[PDB]
Amino acid sequence: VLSPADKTNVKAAWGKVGAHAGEYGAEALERMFLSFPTTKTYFPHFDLSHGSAQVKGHGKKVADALTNAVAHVDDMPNALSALSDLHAHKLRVDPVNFKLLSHCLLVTLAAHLPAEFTPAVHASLDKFLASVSTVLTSKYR
Amino acid sequence: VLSPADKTNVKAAWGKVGAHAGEYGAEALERMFLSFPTTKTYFPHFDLSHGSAQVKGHGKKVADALTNAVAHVDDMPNALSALSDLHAHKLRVDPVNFKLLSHCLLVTLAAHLPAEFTPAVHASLDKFLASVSTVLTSKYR
Amino acid sequence: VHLTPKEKSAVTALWGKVNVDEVGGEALGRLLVVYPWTQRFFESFGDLSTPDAVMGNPKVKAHGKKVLGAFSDGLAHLDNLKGTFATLSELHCDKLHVDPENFRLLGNVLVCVLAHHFGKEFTPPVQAAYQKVVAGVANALAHKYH
Amino acid sequence: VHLTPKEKSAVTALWGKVNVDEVGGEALGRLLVVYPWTQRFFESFGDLSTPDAVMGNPKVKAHGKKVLGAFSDGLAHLDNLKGTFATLSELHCDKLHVDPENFRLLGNVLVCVLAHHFGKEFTPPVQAAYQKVVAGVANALAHKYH
Numbered sequence: 001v002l003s004p005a006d007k008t009n010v011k012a013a014w015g016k017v018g019a020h021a022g023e024y025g026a027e028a029l030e031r032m033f034l035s036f037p038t039t040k041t042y043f044p045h046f047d048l049s050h051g052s053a054q055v056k057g058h059g060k061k062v063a064d065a066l067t068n069a070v071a072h073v074d075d076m077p078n079a080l081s082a083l084s085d086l087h088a089h090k091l092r093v094d095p096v097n098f099k100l101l102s103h104c105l106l107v108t109l110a111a112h113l114p115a116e117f118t119p120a121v122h123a124s125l126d127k128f129l130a131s132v133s134t135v136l137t138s139k140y141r
Numbered sequence: 142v143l144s145p146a147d148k149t150n151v152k153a154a155w156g157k158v159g160a161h162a163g164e165y166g167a168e169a170l171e172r173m174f175l176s177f178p179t180t181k182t183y184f185p186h187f188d189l190s191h192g193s194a195q196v197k198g199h200g201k202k203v204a205d206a207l208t209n210a211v212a213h214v215d216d217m218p219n220a221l222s223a224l225s226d227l228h229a230h231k232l233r234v235d236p237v238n239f240k241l242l243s244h245c246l247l248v249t250l251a252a253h254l255p256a257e258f259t260p261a262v263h264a265s266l267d268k269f270l271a272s273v274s275t276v277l278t279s280k281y282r
Numbered sequence: 283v284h285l286t287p288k289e290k291s292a293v294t295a296l297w298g299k300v301n302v303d304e305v306g307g308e309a310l311g312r313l314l315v316v317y318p319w320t321q322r323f324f325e326s327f328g329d330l331s332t333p334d335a336v337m338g339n340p341k342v343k344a345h346g347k348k349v350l351g352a353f354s355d356g357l358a359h360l361d362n363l364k365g366t367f368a369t370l371s372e373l374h375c376d377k378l379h380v381d382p383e384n385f386r387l388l389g390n391v392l393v394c395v396l397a398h399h400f401g402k403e404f405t406p407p408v409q410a411a412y413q414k415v416v417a418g419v420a421n422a423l424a425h426k427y428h
Numbered sequence: 429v430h431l432t433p434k435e436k437s438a439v440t441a442l443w444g445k446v447n448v449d450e451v452g453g454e455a456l457g458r459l460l461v462v463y464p465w466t467q468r469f470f471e472s473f474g475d476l477s478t479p480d481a482v483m484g485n486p487k488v489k490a491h492g493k494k495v496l497g498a499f500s501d502g503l504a505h506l507d508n509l510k511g512t513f514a515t516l517s518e519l520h521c522d523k524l525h526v527d528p529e530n531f532r533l534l535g536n537v538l539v540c541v542l543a544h545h546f547g548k549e550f551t552p553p554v555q556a557a558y559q560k561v562v563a564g565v566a567n568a569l570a571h572k573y574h
């Protein structure tokens with residue numbers, strides 16, 4: 001469960017991301033594809049090279065979903081229900097892969113927001129991304 | 142999330158366990174300790190040998206907790222809140238270990254209830270134990 | 283992986299009683315049912331819409347038989363699983379890109395199937411021996427990732 | 429594990445800039461804060477009640493320094509991590525019984541700390557090279573379980 005302090009920390013850290021939201025999401029995807037090449041197979045219709053417009057565009061989608069989760073942090077299963085259906089049913093994304101993308105999102109935030117990425121905020125962000133991941137993997141049937 | 146069919150399957154399978162509830166819980170613990178010896182370190186005040194009264198008694202506690210979860214399957218975070226605090230805060234149980242005990246519970250049920258352990262019921266039981274595990278690991282802070 | 287003589291005995295004795303035509307298919311079918319994301323790798327197998335559909339699917343039974351053969355092969359070479367599974371590792375890791383967590387999952391489903399079939403004969407010490415084996419196989423199959 | 433020359437270059441170049449007195453403690457401290465069950469293994473370290481308490485704890489900084497030394501040792505022997513980490517594997521697996529998932533977690537926390545310290549210099553390809561390294565170290569430390 002996310003504590004009051006966790007929600008405060010995540011909202012504050014994500015507030016600092018700003019107009020870089022889409023950019024950071026795209027960078028997290030790139031980090032994931034390079035570090036964990038098994039994840040690439042989900043995107044055969046994507047060119048996954050650096051500067052790819054498709055990865056850029058997808059990064060914005062990812063970011064917008066996370067922003068929705070932050071904005072509705074007390075109602076995340078509802079807020080992310082459609083996305084949960086998509087990833088679990090249609091796409092059949094392996095649950096391990098959410099841990100990989102979550103790690104790459106943390107690395108991306110650490111690399112861009114040194115003042116915000118305190119140990120306490122790191123812990124809150126990890127819990128938040130784990131919570132998002134729990135919702136997105138909740139619909140396998 | 143647990144579907145209506147999942148809840149029906151788990152209630153039916155657990156209904157067949159009966160007066161063997163405590164016994165099966167004790168057997169699952171023994172299976173875990175022998176198969177995954179890292180888990181033994183949580184019980185230094187226990188004699189973990191076969192026929193140990195302490196493992197027998199603890200198996201009944203485990204079983205009674207699972208029975209509570211089955212009986213309150215739509216309200217499990219509330220029902221298991223005290224136990225979540227215990228395992229996460231006080232005992233600091235590694236989240237990996239819940240996957241190990243869940244597997245050993247499935248093996249125990251398979252070994253005792255051949256007619257009930259259909260592929261569909263296996264799937265429902267796995268989801269149920271994963272849900273219990275999610276609640277019991279929800280309180281790390 | 284190192285099994286004691288007592289464990290080797292327990293494992294080999296049970297394996298001789300295994301129905302090699304059916305157990306592999308039961309394990310693969312249950313993997314597909316219990317962990318539905320694994321169906322992503324088997325779209326050419328046809329009807330996987332229901333548990334009954336999966337378990338009765340001829341391609342699942344046929345492929346399951348091949349998997350069990352590989353486990354049988356591993357049981358004969360417990361002291362050289364890496365060499366034994368080299369080609370399969372290249373296939374599952376380099377060509378298929380299956381996350382290695384799923385090797386562990388299939389191994390644990392196999393252990394559930396053995397428990398189902400053998401009942402009280404699948405004692406806690408027998409299970410512990412089989413857990414060593416399926417862990418060894420999973421690690422060997424994942425070698426190309428290491 | 430096999431790094432390309434380009435990856436080896438990227439890894440070695442960054443590591444030379446690492447503050448070896450501090451980074452290990454930052455990684456160990458963050459492990460204890462982010463994954464609080466790991467505190468079970470460090471009850472003799474004293475005050476771990478708050479994040480500030482953990483990060484400022486002299487024993488955490490001191491031990492963290494030893495961990496980083498081991499990673500440094502691994503970077504010098506990428507072609508023989510198993511031998512390099514043999515004694516540490518016996519300690520962490522046979523004596524301490526730490527679940528090996530936590531070796532992976534500490535490695536990933538280290539990668540976060542490197543990203544924190546180096547910023548845009550910790551590029552996606554540099555990260556990918558370091559992920560190979562920390563995976564290799566984790567697997568080598570877990571050898572006694574295999």
Ligand code: HEM
Nearest residue numbers: 039042043061062065066083087091093097098101132133
């Ligand atoms: C924090 C975790 C994640 C978030 C917030 C997220 C969010 C999203 C969003 C917003 C979309 C687009 C939905 C739409 O356009 O209707 C999407 C699609 C997709 N996601 Fe994710 N996702 C996450 C994790 C993952 C992971 C781990 C994988 C696989 C490794 C994955 C694979 C995909 C694929 C393949 C698509 C479809 C792309 C396409 O066909 O164009 N997602 N996701």
Ligand code: HEM
Nearest residue numbers: 180183184202203206207224228232234238239242273274
């Ligand atoms: C399905 C999962 C689990 C259930 C339902 C469960 C249930 C319980 C219950 C009912 C108790 C006794 C509570 C009390 O007496 O106040 C307990 C205690 C305990 N549990 Fe679990 N547990 C689970 C998983 C685990 C795992 C995976 C571990 C470690 C590997 C673990 C380690 C312990 C320990 C060390 C105690 C305290 C024993 C003592 O000090 O006497 N539990 N658990």
Ligand code: HEM
Nearest residue numbers: 320323324348349352353374380384385388389419420423
């Ligand atoms: C211990 C674990 C496993 C063993 C021993 C095993 C063994 C095998 C064997 C013997 C084959 C036949 C290779 C041949 O025809 O020469 C095969 C093929 C295949 N495996 Fe597995 N397997 C395991 C896990 C998995 C998992 C978990 C997945 C996916 C979730 C998977 C996906 C596949 C696919 C898609 C093929 C067909 C490849 C082709 O025909 O081109 N395997 N495996």
Ligand code: HEM
Nearest residue numbers: 466469470494495498499520526530531534535565566569
């Ligand atoms: C890549 C991962 C790791 C590396 C490289 C590493 C390295 C080390 C080193 C160099 C020592 C000092 C040994 C000595 O004094 O000779 C040590 C001790 C220790 N490690 Fe780690 N470690 C890792 C992961 C972990 C984790 C995840 C835990 C627990 C969650 C852990 C628990 C301990 C403990 C309790 C000691 C003290 C043992 C003693 O002094 O008797 N280690 N480790």
